[PDB]
Amino acid sequence: PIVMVHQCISPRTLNAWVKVVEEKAFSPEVIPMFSALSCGATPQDLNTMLNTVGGHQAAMQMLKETINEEAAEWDRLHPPGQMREPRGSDIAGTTSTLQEQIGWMTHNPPIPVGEIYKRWIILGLNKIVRMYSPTSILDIRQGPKEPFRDYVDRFYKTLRAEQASQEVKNAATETLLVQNANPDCKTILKALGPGATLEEMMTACQ
Amino acid sequence: PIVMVHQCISPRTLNAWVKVVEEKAFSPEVIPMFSALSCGATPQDLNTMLNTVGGHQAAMQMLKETINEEAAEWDRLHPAPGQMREPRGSDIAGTTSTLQEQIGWMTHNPPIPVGEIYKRWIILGLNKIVRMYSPTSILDIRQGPKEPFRDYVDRFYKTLRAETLLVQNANPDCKTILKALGPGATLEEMMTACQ
Amino acid sequence: PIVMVHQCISPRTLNAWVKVVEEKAFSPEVIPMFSALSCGATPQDLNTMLNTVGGHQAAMQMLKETINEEAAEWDRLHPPGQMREPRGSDIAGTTSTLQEQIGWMTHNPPIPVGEIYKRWIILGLNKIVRMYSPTSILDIRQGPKEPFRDYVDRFYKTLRAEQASQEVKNAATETLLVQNANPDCKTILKALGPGATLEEMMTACQ
Amino acid sequence: PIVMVHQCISPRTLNAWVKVVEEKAFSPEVIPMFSALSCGATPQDLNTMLNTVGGHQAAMQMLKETINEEAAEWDRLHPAPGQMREPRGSDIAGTTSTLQEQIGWMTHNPPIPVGEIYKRWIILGLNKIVRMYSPTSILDIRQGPKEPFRDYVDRFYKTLRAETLLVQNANPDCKTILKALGPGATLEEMMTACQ
Amino acid sequence: PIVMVHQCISPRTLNAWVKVVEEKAFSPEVIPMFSALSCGATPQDLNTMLNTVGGHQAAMQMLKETINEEAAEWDRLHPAPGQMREPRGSDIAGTTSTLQEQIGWMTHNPPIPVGEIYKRWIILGLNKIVRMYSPTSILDIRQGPKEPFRDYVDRFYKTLRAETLLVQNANPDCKTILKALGPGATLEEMMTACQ
Amino acid sequence: PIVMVHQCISPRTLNAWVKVVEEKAFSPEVIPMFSALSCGATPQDLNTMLNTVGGHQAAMQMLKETINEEAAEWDRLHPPGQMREPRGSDIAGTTSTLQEQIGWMTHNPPIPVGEIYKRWIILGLNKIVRMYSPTSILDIRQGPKEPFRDYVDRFYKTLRAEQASQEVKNAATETLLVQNANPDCKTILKALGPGATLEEMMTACQ
Ligand SMILES: CC(C)(C#Cc1ccc(-c2ccc(Cl)c3c(NS(C)(=O)=O)nn(CC(F)(F)F)c23)c([C@H](Cc2cc(F)cc(F)c2)NC(=O)Cn2nc(C(F)(F)F)c3c2C(F)(F)[C@@H]2C[C@H]32)n1)S(C)(=O)=O
Ligand SMILES: CC(C)(C#Cc1ccc(-c2ccc(Cl)c3c(NS(C)(=O)=O)nn(CC(F)(F)F)c23)c([C@H](Cc2cc(F)cc(F)c2)NC(=O)Cn2nc(C(F)(F)F)c3c2C(F)(F)[C@@H]2C[C@H]32)n1)S(C)(=O)=O
Ligand SMILES: CC(C)(C#Cc1ccc(-c2ccc(Cl)c3c(NS(C)(=O)=O)nn(CC(F)(F)F)c23)c([C@H](Cc2cc(F)cc(F)c2)NC(=O)Cn2nc(C(F)(F)F)c3c2C(F)(F)[C@@H]2C[C@H]32)n1)S(C)(=O)=O
Ligand SMILES: CC(C)(C#Cc1ccc(-c2ccc(Cl)c3c(NS(C)(=O)=O)nn(CC(F)(F)F)c23)c([C@H](Cc2cc(F)cc(F)c2)NC(=O)Cn2nc(C(F)(F)F)c3c2C(F)(F)[C@@H]2C[C@H]32)n1)S(C)(=O)=O
Ligand SMILES: CC(C)(C#Cc1ccc(-c2ccc(Cl)c3c(NS(C)(=O)=O)nn(CC(F)(F)F)c23)c([C@H](Cc2cc(F)cc(F)c2)NC(=O)Cn2nc(C(F)(F)F)c3c2C(F)(F)[C@@H]2C[C@H]32)n1)S(C)(=O)=O
Ligand SMILES: CC(C)(C#Cc1ccc(-c2ccc(Cl)c3c(NS(C)(=O)=O)nn(CC(F)(F)F)c23)c([C@H](Cc2cc(F)cc(F)c2)NC(=O)Cn2nc(C(F)(F)F)c3c2C(F)(F)[C@@H]2C[C@H]32)n1)S(C)(=O)=O
């Protein structure tokens, strides 16, 4: 990473990333973990992290195709001894050296190729998280003997993995959460009506 | 975090927070653990920690609604090129502010401590979650007839933690001993007397 | 902690304290562990450590009442832009900010509120260690088939948890150790008489 | 390593490399792990890491023979008191050079990066080892009749990693779905279609 | 410890010492572990490490009595506002000295190294404990008739560690081989001969 | 160690050495582990590391006799307020203080007593690795149903533990490897003839 001087990847940062994917796969928390463990990363560090992912090579190829899509858009938007202009392949670290990546990231002003690449990767990880969610939000309904908290847990766990704006996800919640509570809770919830906080809803259905 | 220069979140700090929620859920010790592990945190760091919470998404939405309540109050109380702008509640929560803006606010002279402000909102929300997930009222904590007094007091204050009654809820044999001490006994004296 | 500048609690120091209490409860070694892990701690750090204690809330309330006792004694002894005088509640961190605690601890000369509070806590932990010792020293007697070393181990393990001066504890040893050895060892021990070292006693009864 | 001053190898860096070979042998992720854990390494550090590999001594001799091939090519391309001498291939590999000579080359103005050069030779050898120890050809990766498409693609690119065909090797039901998409489908579209 | 400025004891240094006593008790390797983990330690640090020893309180009282013996000898050999006072044995052991006094002695020009002095007393006591807890005399270590020579030598020097005889205590078949070598054989020659 | 100022042994370096010997004993990888974990070590650090070795006291006495041999050779070759000349016992740290060892190692120019001692120890460890190898190279022969890679693994594992020059070990390989392959592979190997790489041999016998 760049901390401005270049620094070696630490073994613990690398191991922390491998362990996250091993234990959580592509649960939504992989994205905050990747962003935090990739703080300051060069494109070379980013490629190291992705290359250490064990298995899940279908998702990694999907990630690659997302990167190629974003690099093509970068090239569309941005066609001796001096700083080169980075193309998409440079940002992805396929056609650029570490020395060039350091030069871009530490220049005044910088071309933050590490942050640009990280954005493309996170977009790819968002797609993977959506693709690998085992549930769809229309199928989350409160069981007749499921505590309301357990149902809300399942609801937002599913909604968390979908790829959409926060405002879009909130519309889905207003459309489905109370409506798919079980009969006894749904009537209590509708009696409270809109504007009830989730805290108030959970107290009323406990 | 900011320690003023910005530093990356530490991998151990990150893992420590995930592990605490994994192992203890929302027992009351999650609050001091969060406060200690979020020392110096930016709003981006704070959203990172909260986003790494596995499961418990009902609690996390409740936390989100507490943050929005506090952000709305911030906006009620606090409604140029190259100059520093005034943070809204959404800026403090990190939904409409960049990391550079957060660093700028947090390191300014004088600082707008958006990380500390957001952390206060989060801890208020965590307090609500700890209360919500406590399974028992203090009224229902009563010493069993064969329960050692120390175990009963352990359950009592563990329950109070998440929220004269100690004497009233003791079992008949110990209540008689405790009443004979007279009011004003220390807990150590009560525990010695009913040992 | 203060190391003079303030520094964040480290996750490992915090975890080390939680693990000590988890594994040892209120064995006497909790006190050296707490003192070492709380080196440089502010009252806020000290409250963080105590608040992370899992369970044992009876002891924690007893600790609280010891702190309130000491703070009341501090207040009895010690009734723009300048340094405030700390009351007992300030030292315990209930009515003081971290900024004020840093100010006291780094002042020239300092009001060492962290060390003062730590003293009150350790006094409280000493009480808890005494209260939670499962044995009393009068009940430690060498079995007819217990090796002398095992008996001495049990004797000093019990004496270690009692709350008393070192000179008082040494008086109890002179009163009880040889006297409560089993018949065969007690005669050998008395034959050596006083002034024998524990090394010499253990050789003579092995 | 050199970070320019020479530093001792870290015990965690050392253990991390031993553990990776212990747990994953020569799966393809050994290459990025070696490259990351050998950041800044001298040839002495690199020989230390390789000498700590437990077992797999056939692979290690193959690595040795790759290094000698590259060293011979270096000598083909690049054949005074107190002055700095020109490194041979054996000097870059650390068989005939001292640590002080390696430090001198690596820190000179301009530097002869013997650590980076040796690391390139080693990674070329590790690439050969990864290929040799892959048990399967991509031609033999075909979707089972009850195999979910995602599991098949997982095996496919895991196999390719160590080395239109994806469509041809899919099972009849999915191949029909994939052909109906027309050429040019993204992998995400193929995976959605055969989900 | 002092590294000169005073530093807090490290949590890992602390845990490393507790773990060593937990796992190996008072096998001889406890001595080098204590010496290494007490590098730079003040008398307060040294009392902290010793106070964290779990169990083994008979050994710890023996250690205490050794310290008092050495402290009495110190007082036999070495019997003003703002000035530095002369440390007694109790000051070196940390029973009558403050941390600031210990820091003052240890960092003075020239220093009174009370931490190193106390550490020598402690190691003398630990040596006594290692001897006391060794269960066997070297006279009772003899090679079994089916015991490989290497295992016997392992037991032999492990026993000597805690405290011609090697030849005399070997079994008849190996003793004959060793006598035929003649005196002056290295241990490697003896081990090769009786392999 | 010396990093030029003296520094305490780190607990993790020490634990890493103890764990290596615990898990690997005197497999050949003990030597690179010892050399890396002893980087910068004083003779006192080196004695600390060797003294923490659990068990294996026969090898440790053999190591001691190797050190005494090398120290005797050093003494043969190298018979107020100024720097003392180190004898072999000084280099081994038996008759020298840490202060003297620091003085030698940090002098201008240095007497690198830490590196000298480390050389003697590694020579001793080489002997121990050879002595404790459970196989001899003449006994490594490819089974009739052993994959060629498994046989080569066993061959070089055995050869790795022998104490000899690399050129000597390579002569043993040319003398024995193909010659002790099983009949079917040996004929394929001889058909390729000399100059075949091990990669080519392993492909031809797979
Ligand atoms: C080891 C080291 C020295 C290095 C490097 C290194 C250098 C560059 C690149 C790279 C980066 C971005 C793109 Cl977009 C492409 C590209 N896009 S392209 C031109 O259209 O094919 N190609 N490349 C290879 C390049 F540059 F060589 F051309 C890349 C990689 C990627 C990093 C990566 C890993 C990952 F998991 C997911 C990603 F999105 C990106 N790793 C690979 O690609 C390895 N891989 N191999 C194959 C296959 F076998 F099928 F072919 C497959 C992968 C895969 F990606 F995992 C995915 C399953 C398919 N690593 S290091 C620094 O890590 O120590
Ligand atoms: C990954 C990364 C790059 C980032 C970021 C990032 C950026 C901003 C915000 C955020 C912060 C504060 C508020 Cl108040 C809102 C808000 N309030 S609002 C406008 O009224 O909806 N919205 N946001 C999203 C924003 F900004 F996009 F709008 C936020 C988040 C939160 C952080 C957070 C996590 C948490 F657990 C509890 C919290 F209180 C806050 N995370 C999410 O919200 C994710 N999430 N998604 C849903 C879903 F919609 F599915 F139901 C749900 C959550 C949930 F919160 F967990 C809860 C279960 C419901 N993260 S990073 C820095 O972590 O690396
Ligand atoms: C989370 C965070 C932000 C903070 C803080 C924070 C701030 C202040 C204080 C505090 C400190 C000292 C005293 Cl004397 C009192 C006091 N004495 S009093 C006026 O006479 O009641 N009160 N306080 C609360 C105050 F200040 F709010 F008033 C305190 C605490 C204590 C710290 C503490 C924990 C502990 F284990 C043992 C201690 F001796 C002290 N924690 C609590 O008290 C929590 N607790 N709650 C209850 C109960 F539910 F029964 F009520 C019970 C406890 C308990 F102590 F554990 C014990 C079982 C009984 N923590 S942080 C920095 O940790 O991240
Ligand atoms: C311990 C320490 C102080 C050191 C050093 C040290 C110094 C130099 C070298 C070395 C480096 C490069 C080449 Cl190309 C040759 C070479 N090529 S050659 C002239 O044509 O034979 N020889 N050397 C030995 C040299 F220099 F002595 F000549 C080397 C090694 C290698 C490092 C290495 C390990 C590895 F796994 C794979 C590698 F590619 C390189 N280690 C060995 O070779 C050990 N080894 N032994 C044999 C045996 F002979 F038994 F079959 C075998 C190996 C083996 F390689 F593992 C492989 C299975 C065969 N280590 S340290 C710094 O680690 O602390
Ligand atoms: C907690 C903390 C704040 C502190 C401190 C603190 C301060 C001073 C001392 C101390 C040091 C040296 C000597 Cl010579 C004597 C002494 N010699 S004497 C006058 O002749 O009695 N006395 N002391 C106590 C003093 F100073 F108070 F007087 C000491 C101790 C010792 C440290 C120690 C532990 C150990 F294991 C072995 C040692 F050799 C020394 N610990 C104790 O003695 C505790 N202990 N208690 C008893 C009991 F009485 F129950 F039998 C027993 C012990 C025991 F030693 F373990 C042994 C089994 C017997 N610790 S901290 C810095 O650790 O955070
Ligand atoms: C604890 C501490 C403060 C210290 C120190 C300390 C100081 C010096 C020395 C030492 C160093 C080198 C030589 Cl050559 C001799 C020597 N050679 S000699 C004159 O011809 O006998 N003697 N010494 C002891 C000296 F100096 F005291 F004389 C040494 C040792 C050795 C270090 C060592 C350990 C090891 F494993 C292997 C080694 F090659 C060297 N440790 C011992 O020798 C302990 N030991 N004891 C016996 C026995 F019981 F049989 F006797 C046996 C050993 C043994 F070596 F393990 C081997 C099984 C036989 N340690 S510390 C810094 O570690 O914290």
Side-chain angles (χ1 to χ4, degrees), chain A residues 1-189 191-206, chain B residues 1-178 180-195, chain C residues 1-189 191-206, chain D residues 1-178 180-195, chain E residues 1-178 180-195, chain F residues 1-189 191-206:
Chain A
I2 308 286
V3 296
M4 304 300 294
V5 305
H6 175 267
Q7 170 173 294
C8 288
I9 316 187
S10 87
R12 199 223 187 277
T13 295
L14 209 47
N15 184 56
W17 167 242
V18 179
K19 285 332 181 222
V20 162
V21 180
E22 274 180 9
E23 298 172 13
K24 299 275 198 305
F26 299 108
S27 206
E29 50 261 63
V30 72
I31 293 147
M33 284 313 282
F34 179 77
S35 149
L37 298 171
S38 71
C39 157
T42 66
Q44 179 191 66
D45 303 323
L46 292 165
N47 284 330
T48 300
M49 297 176 70
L50 299 178
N51 275 327
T52 61
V53 170
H56 308 283
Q57 293 298 280
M60 292 309 101
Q61 177 64 27
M62 284 197 292
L63 183 49
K64 213 147 125 181
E65 292 182 8
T66 300
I67 296 162
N68 278 317
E69 283 166 37
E70 296 305 294
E73 173 75 357
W74 173 272
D75 289 346
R76 183 184 85 72
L77 286 186
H78 297 105
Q82 311 307 293
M83 184 172 75
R84 202 154 64 68
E85 292 187 276
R87 313 163 260 128
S89 54
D90 294 313
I91 292 169
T94 64
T95 58
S96 66
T97 69
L98 169 63
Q99 296 62 42
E100 292 175 324
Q101 294 163 23
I102 290 165
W104 288 317
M105 289 167 74
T106 59
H107 201 75
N108 185 227
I111 308 173
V113 299
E115 296 294 338
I116 299 164
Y117 192 18
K118 194 184 310 172
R119 284 205 302 274
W120 304 347
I121 293 163
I122 285 180
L123 179 66
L125 288 171
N126 284 327
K127 299 183 185 177
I128 293 162
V129 166
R130 160 180 57 79
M131 284 278 301
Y132 286 13
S133 175
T135 49
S136 41
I137 196 62
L138 290 171
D139 290 330
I140 307 301
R141 291 164 216 157
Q142 179 180 23
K145 52 207 277 214
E146 185 185 22
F148 184 64
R149 180 205 297 170
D150 289 350
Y151 156 66
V152 181
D153 270 350
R154 290 195 300 115
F155 188 90
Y156 279 107
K157 173 174 169 179
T158 302
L159 192 51
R160 178 85 178 268
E162 305 198 345
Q163 186 179 12
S165 91
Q166 184 62 69
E167 309 92 271
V168 162
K169 294 192 181 198
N170 288 342
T173 294
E174 301 170 1
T175 306
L176 297 173
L177 184 60
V178 173
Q179 294 80 352
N180 283 337
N182 68 27
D184 284 343
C185 180
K186 179 175 181 163
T187 321
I188 294 169
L189 290 188
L192 303 171
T197 62
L198 180 56
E199 179 181 31
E200 288 163 351
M201 302 178 147
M202 280 159 90
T203 54
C205 277
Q206 89 170 104
Chain B
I2 311 287
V3 292
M4 312 308 289
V5 302
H6 178 272
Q7 280 196 347
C8 297
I9 298 197
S10 148
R12 284 204 31 130
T13 300
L14 210 45
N15 184 247
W17 166 241
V18 178
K19 288 299 169 188
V20 152
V21 175
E22 282 184 359
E23 298 171 6
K24 292 179 161 59
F26 298 101
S27 307
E29 49 262 60
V30 73
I31 294 145
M33 289 297 316
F34 178 81
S35 148
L37 297 172
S38 67
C39 180
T42 67
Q44 171 187 78
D45 301 327
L46 293 164
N47 289 330
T48 295
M49 304 176 61
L50 296 176
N51 275 329
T52 58
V53 171
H56 305 287
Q57 290 299 284
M60 292 305 99
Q61 177 65 27
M62 281 198 294
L63 183 45
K64 187 149 130 158
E65 294 185 356
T66 299
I67 292 157
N68 277 313
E69 272 158 8
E70 299 305 299
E73 177 68 4
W74 175 271
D75 293 342
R76 192 190 73 79
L77 292 164
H78 305 103
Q83 303 318 290
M84 181 157 76
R85 68 189 184 82
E86 312 168 83
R88 295 154 295 167
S90 55
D91 296 314
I92 288 154
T95 70
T96 57
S97 64
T98 70
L99 171 62
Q100 184 53 251
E101 291 174 324
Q102 297 163 22
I103 287 162
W105 290 317
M106 290 171 71
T107 56
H108 193 260
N109 177 59
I112 303 204
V114 299
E116 300 293 342
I117 295 159
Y118 191 21
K119 189 188 306 176
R120 294 203 303 270
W121 302 350
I122 295 165
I123 289 173
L124 271 175
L126 289 176
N127 281 326
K128 291 179 171 172
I129 297 162
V130 168
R131 289 187 228 112
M132 172 145 291
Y133 289 17
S134 184
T136 309
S137 162
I138 193 69
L139 302 167
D140 292 309
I141 304 302
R142 301 176 43 242
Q143 179 183 22
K146 305 281 283 183
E147 182 179 23
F149 187 66
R150 182 196 303 171
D151 296 348
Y152 154 66
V153 181
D154 270 348
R155 298 194 292 114
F156 189 92
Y157 283 98
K158 170 179 186 52
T159 296
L160 193 51
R161 186 75 182 270
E163 282 195 344
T164 186
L165 191 68
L166 191 69
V167 179
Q168 179 75 315
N169 287 5
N171 71 33
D173 279 7
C174 175
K175 188 184 302 197
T176 313
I177 291 168
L178 297 180
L181 301 173
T186 63
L187 179 60
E188 184 193 0
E189 285 161 356
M190 295 171 70
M191 273 161 101
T192 293
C194 283
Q195 182 155 80
Chain C
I2 308 286
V3 296
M4 304 300 294
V5 305
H6 175 267
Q7 170 173 294
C8 288
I9 316 187
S10 87
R12 199 223 187 277
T13 295
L14 209 47
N15 184 56
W17 167 242
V18 179
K19 285 332 181 222
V20 162
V21 180
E22 274 180 9
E23 298 172 13
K24 299 275 198 305
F26 299 108
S27 206
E29 50 261 63
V30 72
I31 293 147
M33 284 313 282
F34 179 77
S35 149
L37 298 171
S38 71
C39 157
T42 66
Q44 179 191 66
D45 303 323
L46 292 165
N47 284 330
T48 300
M49 297 176 70
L50 299 178
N51 275 327
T52 61
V53 170
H56 308 283
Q57 293 298 280
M60 292 309 101
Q61 177 64 27
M62 284 197 292
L63 183 49
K64 213 147 125 181
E65 292 182 8
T66 300
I67 296 162
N68 278 317
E69 283 166 37
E70 296 305 294
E73 173 75 357
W74 173 272
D75 289 346
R76 183 184 85 72
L77 286 186
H78 297 105
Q82 311 307 293
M83 184 172 75
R84 202 154 64 68
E85 292 187 276
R87 313 163 260 128
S89 54
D90 294 313
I91 292 169
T94 64
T95 58
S96 66
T97 69
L98 169 63
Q99 296 62 42
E100 292 175 324
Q101 294 163 23
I102 290 165
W104 288 317
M105 289 167 74
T106 59
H107 201 75
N108 185 227
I111 308 173
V113 299
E115 296 294 338
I116 299 164
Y117 192 18
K118 194 184 310 172
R119 284 205 302 274
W120 304 347
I121 293 163
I122 285 180
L123 179 66
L125 288 171
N126 284 327
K127 299 183 185 177
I128 293 162
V129 166
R130 160 180 57 79
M131 284 278 301
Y132 286 13
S133 175
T135 49
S136 41
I137 196 62
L138 290 171
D139 290 330
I140 307 301
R141 291 164 216 157
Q142 179 180 23
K145 52 207 277 214
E146 185 185 22
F148 184 64
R149 180 205 297 170
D150 289 350
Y151 156 66
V152 181
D153 270 350
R154 290 195 300 115
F155 188 90
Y156 279 107
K157 173 174 169 179
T158 302
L159 192 51
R160 178 85 178 268
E162 305 198 345
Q163 186 179 12
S165 91
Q166 184 62 69
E167 309 92 271
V168 162
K169 294 192 181 198
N170 288 342
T173 294
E174 301 170 1
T175 306
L176 297 173
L177 184 60
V178 173
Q179 294 80 352
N180 283 337
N182 68 27
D184 284 343
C185 180
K186 179 175 181 163
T187 321
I188 294 169
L189 290 188
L192 303 171
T197 62
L198 180 56
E199 179 181 31
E200 288 163 351
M201 302 178 147
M202 280 159 90
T203 54
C205 277
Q206 89 170 104
Chain D
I2 311 287
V3 292
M4 312 308 289
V5 302
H6 178 272
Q7 280 196 347
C8 297
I9 298 197
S10 148
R12 284 204 31 130
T13 300
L14 210 45
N15 184 247
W17 166 241
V18 178
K19 288 299 169 188
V20 152
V21 175
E22 282 184 359
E23 298 171 6
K24 292 179 161 59
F26 298 101
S27 307
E29 49 262 60
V30 73
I31 294 145
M33 289 297 316
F34 178 81
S35 148
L37 297 172
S38 67
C39 180
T42 67
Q44 171 187 78
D45 301 327
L46 293 164
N47 289 330
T48 295
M49 304 176 61
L50 296 176
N51 275 329
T52 58
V53 171
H56 305 287
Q57 290 299 284
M60 292 305 99
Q61 177 65 27
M62 281 198 294
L63 183 45
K64 187 149 130 158
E65 294 185 356
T66 299
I67 292 157
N68 277 313
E69 272 158 8
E70 299 305 299
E73 177 68 4
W74 175 271
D75 293 342
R76 192 190 73 79
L77 292 164
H78 305 103
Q83 303 317 290
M84 181 157 76
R85 68 189 184 82
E86 312 168 83
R88 295 154 295 167
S90 55
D91 296 314
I92 288 154
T95 70
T96 57
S97 64
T98 70
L99 171 62
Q100 184 53 251
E101 291 174 324
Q102 297 163 22
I103 287 162
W105 290 317
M106 290 171 71
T107 56
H108 193 260
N109 177 59
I112 303 204
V114 299
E116 300 293 342
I117 295 159
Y118 191 21
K119 189 188 306 176
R120 294 203 303 270
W121 302 350
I122 295 165
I123 289 173
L124 271 175
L126 289 176
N127 281 326
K128 291 179 171 172
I129 297 162
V130 168
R131 289 187 228 112
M132 172 145 291
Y133 289 17
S134 184
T136 309
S137 162
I138 193 69
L139 302 167
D140 292 309
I141 304 302
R142 301 176 43 242
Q143 179 183 22
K146 305 281 283 183
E147 182 179 23
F149 187 66
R150 182 196 303 171
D151 296 348
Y152 154 66
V153 181
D154 270 348
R155 298 194 292 114
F156 189 92
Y157 283 98
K158 170 179 186 52
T159 296
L160 193 51
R161 186 75 182 270
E163 282 195 344
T164 186
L165 191 68
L166 191 69
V167 179
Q168 179 75 315
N169 287 5
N171 71 33
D173 279 7
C174 175
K175 188 184 302 197
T176 313
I177 291 168
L178 297 180
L181 301 173
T186 63
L187 179 60
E188 184 193 0
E189 285 161 356
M190 295 171 70
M191 273 161 101
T192 293
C194 283
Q195 182 155 80
Chain E
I2 311 287
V3 292
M4 312 308 289
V5 302
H6 178 272
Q7 280 196 347
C8 297
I9 298 197
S10 148
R12 284 204 31 130
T13 300
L14 210 45
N15 184 247
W17 166 241
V18 178
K19 288 299 169 188
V20 152
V21 175
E22 282 184 359
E23 298 171 6
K24 292 179 161 59
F26 298 101
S27 307
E29 49 262 60
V30 73
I31 294 145
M33 289 297 316
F34 178 81
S35 148
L37 297 172
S38 67
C39 180
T42 67
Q44 171 187 78
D45 301 327
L46 293 164
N47 289 330
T48 295
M49 304 176 61
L50 296 176
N51 275 329
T52 58
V53 171
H56 305 287
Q57 290 299 284
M60 292 305 99
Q61 177 65 27
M62 281 198 294
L63 183 45
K64 187 149 130 158
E65 294 185 356
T66 299
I67 292 157
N68 277 313
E69 272 158 8
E70 299 305 299
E73 177 68 4
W74 175 271
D75 293 342
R76 192 190 73 79
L77 292 164
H78 305 103
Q83 303 318 290
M84 181 157 76
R85 68 189 184 82
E86 312 168 83
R88 295 154 295 167
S90 55
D91 296 314
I92 288 154
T95 70
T96 57
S97 64
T98 70
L99 171 62
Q100 184 53 251
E101 291 174 324
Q102 297 163 22
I103 287 162
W105 290 317
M106 290 171 71
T107 56
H108 193 260
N109 177 59
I112 303 204
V114 299
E116 300 293 342
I117 295 159
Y118 191 21
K119 189 188 306 176
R120 294 203 303 270
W121 302 350
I122 295 165
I123 289 173
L124 271 175
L126 289 176
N127 281 326
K128 291 179 171 172
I129 297 162
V130 168
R131 289 187 228 112
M132 172 145 291
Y133 289 17
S134 184
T136 309
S137 162
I138 193 69
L139 302 167
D140 292 309
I141 304 302
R142 301 176 43 242
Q143 179 183 22
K146 305 281 283 183
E147 182 179 23
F149 187 66
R150 182 196 303 171
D151 296 348
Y152 154 66
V153 181
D154 270 348
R155 298 194 292 114
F156 189 92
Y157 283 98
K158 170 179 186 52
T159 296
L160 193 51
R161 186 75 182 270
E163 282 195 344
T164 186
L165 191 68
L166 191 69
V167 179
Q168 179 75 315
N169 287 5
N171 71 33
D173 279 7
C174 175
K175 188 184 302 197
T176 313
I177 291 168
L178 297 180
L181 301 173
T186 63
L187 179 60
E188 184 193 0
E189 285 161 356
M190 295 171 70
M191 273 161 101
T192 293
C194 283
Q195 182 155 80
Chain F
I2 308 286
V3 296
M4 304 300 294
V5 305
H6 175 267
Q7 170 173 294
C8 288
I9 316 187
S10 87
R12 199 223 187 277
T13 295
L14 209 47
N15 184 56
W17 167 242
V18 179
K19 285 332 181 222
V20 162
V21 180
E22 274 180 9
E23 298 172 13
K24 299 275 198 305
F26 299 108
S27 206
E29 50 261 63
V30 72
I31 293 147
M33 284 313 282
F34 179 77
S35 149
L37 298 171
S38 71
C39 157
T42 66
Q44 179 191 66
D45 303 323
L46 292 165
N47 284 330
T48 300
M49 297 176 70
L50 299 178
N51 275 327
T52 61
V53 170
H56 308 283
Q57 293 298 280
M60 292 309 101
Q61 177 64 27
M62 284 197 292
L63 183 49
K64 213 147 125 181
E65 292 182 8
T66 300
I67 296 162
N68 278 317
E69 283 166 37
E70 296 305 294
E73 173 75 357
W74 173 272
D75 289 346
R76 183 184 85 72
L77 286 186
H78 297 105
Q82 311 307 293
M83 184 172 75
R84 202 154 64 68
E85 292 187 276
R87 313 163 260 128
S89 54
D90 294 313
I91 292 169
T94 64
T95 58
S96 66
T97 69
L98 169 63
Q99 296 62 42
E100 292 175 324
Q101 294 162 23
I102 290 165
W104 288 317
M105 289 167 74
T106 59
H107 201 75
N108 185 227
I111 308 173
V113 299
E115 296 294 338
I116 299 164
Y117 192 18
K118 194 184 310 172
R119 284 205 302 274
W120 304 347
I121 293 163
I122 285 180
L123 179 66
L125 288 171
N126 284 327
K127 299 183 185 177
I128 293 162
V129 166
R130 160 180 57 79
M131 284 278 301
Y132 286 13
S133 175
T135 49
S136 41
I137 196 62
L138 290 171
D139 290 330
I140 307 301
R141 291 164 216 157
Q142 179 180 23
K145 52 207 277 214
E146 185 185 22
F148 184 64
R149 180 205 297 170
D150 289 350
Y151 156 66
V152 181
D153 270 350
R154 290 195 300 115
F155 188 90
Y156 279 107
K157 173 174 169 179
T158 302
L159 192 51
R160 178 85 178 268
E162 305 198 345
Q163 186 179 12
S165 91
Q166 184 62 69
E167 309 92 271
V168 162
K169 294 192 181 198
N170 288 342
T173 294
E174 301 170 1
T175 306
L176 297 173
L177 184 60
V178 173
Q179 294 80 352
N180 283 337
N182 68 27
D184 284 343
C185 180
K186 179 175 181 163
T187 321
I188 294 169
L189 290 188
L192 303 171
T197 62
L198 180 56
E199 179 181 31
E200 288 163 351
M201 302 178 147
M202 280 159 90
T203 54
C205 277
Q206 89 170 104

